[PDB]
Design a protein around this nucleic acid. Structure first.
Lengths: 93, 44, 275
RNA sequence: CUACCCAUGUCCAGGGUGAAGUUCAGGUAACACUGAAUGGAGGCCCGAACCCACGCACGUUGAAAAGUGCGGGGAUGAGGU
RNA sequence: UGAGUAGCGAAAGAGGGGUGAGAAUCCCCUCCACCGAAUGCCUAAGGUUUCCUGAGGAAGGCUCGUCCGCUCAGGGUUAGUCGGGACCUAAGCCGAGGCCGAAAGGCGUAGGCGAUGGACAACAGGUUGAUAUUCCUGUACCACCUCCUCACCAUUUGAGCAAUGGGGGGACGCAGGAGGAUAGGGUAAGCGCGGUAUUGGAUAUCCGCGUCCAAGCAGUUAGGCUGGGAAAUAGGCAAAUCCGUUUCCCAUAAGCCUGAGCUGUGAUGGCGAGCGAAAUAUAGUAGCGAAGUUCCUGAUUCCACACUGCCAAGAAAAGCCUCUAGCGAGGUGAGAGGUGCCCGUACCGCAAACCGACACAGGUAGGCGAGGAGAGAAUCCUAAGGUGAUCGAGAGAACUCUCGUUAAGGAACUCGGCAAAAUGACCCCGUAACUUCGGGAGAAGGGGUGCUCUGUUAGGGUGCAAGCCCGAGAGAGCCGCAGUGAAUAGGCCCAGGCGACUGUUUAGCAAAAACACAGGUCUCUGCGAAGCCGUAAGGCGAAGUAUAGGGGCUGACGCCUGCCCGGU
């Protein structure tokens, strides 16, 4: 702790993930309290493919509703992360 | 014309907010009656 | 001197500003400006305990020896400058130490005059020395009370004092407005009546110069509601009804003496308040 | 919200009136004094943004729990924000 | 119940097609119309997804409704340089110790927080159905550190770091006006269009455009400095080669510090009028892309609170430059090469997304804010842009409101010229009583203006000329009822009462003869203060000192302010 593995959770597969993944940049959610340089700790040590850049957004939650019962989505914090040239990718495959 | 809730993030949170009512002993009685009643929104 | 304004509008029809001949330079010493906050008649609580102050222009204090603790080394008046914190002006002095000190300006001085401040010093206007060495009958200002405290006594523009005749302890002083106080003898004092003598004849003229200074306006006695002020009432412009005129507190303000009767100044007066 | 204060920023389209002060020509013995040009100060003058709230009409279970339409006062200051 | 009644919340749509079961209200196109110193854009206060797509449509939409800011289902905000925190401080707040007080607490030192301030490194394009001085494409810049390379010192007879220590500097008001430059706008050169069917125009005819950074170099309008050097110091807690004080030398500018902007650079880049292919999960984009200059006008910006003047005399600490104390053995510099965090980034921000119970003719900082006429942000009409304001149809009555005409008479109406009508822009003539000598006074009362020509007028600004602009003044002549033909621009003039005046007040009936006001006074107060708020501590008064504060009375100016101390 803080390990590389628990920092990331998933890749986020949207229409944005179609065009960005062909340009050596990849989407990942990160935990709520994990900074930019903890993300470079992951991809170097989990994936072995060296980071070009880390760019981190965060979102607030949409307060959805079901019936009478209204409540708020958990807050999300994604990360567009770029890699070097001459370096592969270790996605779903 | 002008009405009385000219909204502020700062001035609302400083007059009425939390640590302002953990400040004084009379201000914490406001945080006692907000607890023995058992409201959800403790002081706004 | 005092100029007078030609009535170009109705703001001007009485107003006078002084000639500003005594002053030499505008931009003061940067290294003795002390900053100020206009307080506005407020208290340390926050209540406004002084009526009708506030409104003024941005003042900025300049540090003044009202003591002249340093001694013997002659001064050499560089410039005489203007200070919004009081009536009179201030003369900048370059001592031979380099201790550039704003020190209150008596009349008759210009650039270049020697000003010592020892007990050995002269009776040239400006020189300062304790009251034992002062001879009977000189024009003195900047008097203190306790030795070395600071010149609480006389300071304002165009005022002075005397020395009537003294002992070892104390030195009698006919102060301004006639009070003869047995002022202590080793009290440091300085010599001369205070410059800018024509401050009184300055006709203010237009209303807002008392707001420029500033002073908030005052609301009189039979104007406020009979709640708020103990003269007010009537069906408008009623006579000043109740016996013993009365402040906005219940105390008469025609001649009702306000000195403590049991007070330290029962010994320290030979003659008081000629009225 | 509003009354007052304090600290710090910000706003005031345009054009007029012309003083103090100066310079020059004249003037006395020096002053005084007088006229030209220069000069732009002023809770000055007009008038818009802005602020106010005197008329009138309307509206009055209103578009509006205080406004709207024509007009109006202040508009470099004791100013508005 | 009233009652299918009041109301449907200012403000032009119309026509064709399409969608669908259904269309005036949905979409597209084409005509027309409105704001255009706002109804435009950009971004705060706030709001918390209202943004985009794909479906629905019961409910909220003041009516329908295939539609929505409604419902669902997904998608949506990328920052070392932008705002804010790893910087500092203002009023204020909190406050170890401390001081007062039955308690709780009140205040407050050292300290620290707290921008609306000070300091501060990035820019021009592209880009999507959604984000941009973030992604990306080119340049840059900022700080830190060295696995590296070189350059230069010195080895405590010491390179350098040099401070929370000392200085300096940051560092500041308002008014006015030159200059100088840029934004911005418009002719002549050019380059792509084009020759028009309604008379005439291959013709000085028409349409459109005409560019561009931050960093870098180089100098510059111009601004300061008070001049610069040497020498000595009763100072600056301690120190100082720093600053301040004093003595000489040189003073026509040598020397410094700062600059708006110009110029090749930046760029053999990338926009650009327009050509808009393949058809593509038919956005129709990609792609292709000529000239791209001179001239004139020009600020409400900048140089710059710089200059001049005026008084009412105009924030503080660090970033930054120095000088010591102390470190100190390997350091300074250059290039290569690394590191660079947290939050904020969607969308509305004069609105249908906020404050108004409402998608309510209201209220909401600041920065951009064009053309013709014009002084101007006036006012009108238009480009840039945005908008058709979400019940309409069709009669043309009473009556209400909003307006516009009215013959003849004009205040007879009325408490009252309430109200309307009227006057108004420049230029010129001319202008009284009265006065505090400034005014009054835009007093009053009058005359001129449209166009053509003489005439690239006279003469100025600018330019070398060419060329534009800016143009009084006049003579001839034209036409109209009308010449500031429209819109916006004062109605005056006597005589009175009150109040000097500009101002302020009863937010939401009363702006006034009320209050303020300068001036006048009477009085108290010698400073641990008179009065204050405090139970007191503390603080105002005040880094004030009887030419100053507090209290009262009266209210510019002029003439004055007569009599009674019995009462109280």
């Amino acid at each position: 702790m803080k390990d590389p593995r628990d920092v990331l959770k998933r890749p986020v597969i949207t229409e944005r993930s179609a065009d960005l993944m062909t340009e050596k940049k990849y989407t990942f959610e990160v935990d709520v309290r994990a900074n930019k340089t903890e993300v470079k700790d992951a991809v170097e040590s989990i994936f072995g493919v060296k980071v070009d850049k880390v760019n981190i957004m965060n979102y607030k939650g949409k307060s959805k509703r079901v019936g009478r019962y209204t409540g708020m989505t958990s807050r999300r914090r994604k990360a567009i992360v770029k890699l070097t040239a001459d370096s592969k990718e270790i996605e779903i495959f | 014309m002008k009405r009385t809730f000219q909204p502020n993030n700062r001035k609302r949170s400083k007059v009425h907010g939390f640590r302002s009512r953990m400040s004084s002993k009379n201000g914490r009685l406001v945080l006692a009656r907000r607890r023995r009643k058992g409201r959800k929104v403790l002081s706004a | 001197a005092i100029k007078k304004y030609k009535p170009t509008s109705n703001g001007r029809r009485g107003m006078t500003t002084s000639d500003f001949a005594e002053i030499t330079t505008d931009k003061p010493e940067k290294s003795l400006l002390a900053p100020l906050h206009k307080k506005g008649g407020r208290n340390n609580q926050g209540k406004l305990t002084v009526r009708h102050q506030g409104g003024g222009h941005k003042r900025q204090y300049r540090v003044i020896d009202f003591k002249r603790d340093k001694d013997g080394i002659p001064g050499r008046v560089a410039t005489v400058e203007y200070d919004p914190n009081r009536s009179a002006n201030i003369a900048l002095i370059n001592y031979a130490d380099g201790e550039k000190r704003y020190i209150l300006a008596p009349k008759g001085i210009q650039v270049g005059t020697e000003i010592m401040s020892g007990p050995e010093a002269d009776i040239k206007v400006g020189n300062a020395l304790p009251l034992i060495n002062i001879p009977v009958g000189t024009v003195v200002h900047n008097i203190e009370l306790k030795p070395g405290k600071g010149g609480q006594l006389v300071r304002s523009a165009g005022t002075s004092a005397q020395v009537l005749g003294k002992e070892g302890k104390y030195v009698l002083v006919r102060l301004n407005s006639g009070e003869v106080r047995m002022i202590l003898s080793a009290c440091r004092a300085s010599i001369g009546q205070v410059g800018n003598e024509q401050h009184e004849l300055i006709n203010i003229g237009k209303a807002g110069r008392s707001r420029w200074k500033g002073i908030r306006p005052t609301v009189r006695g039979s104007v406020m509601n009979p709640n708020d002020h103990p003269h007010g009432g009537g069906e408008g412009r009623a006579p000043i009804g109740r016996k013993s005129p009365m402040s906005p507190w219940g105390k008469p303000t025609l001649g009702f003496k306000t000195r403590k009767k049991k007070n330290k100044s029962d010994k320290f007066i030979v003659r008081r308040r000629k009225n």
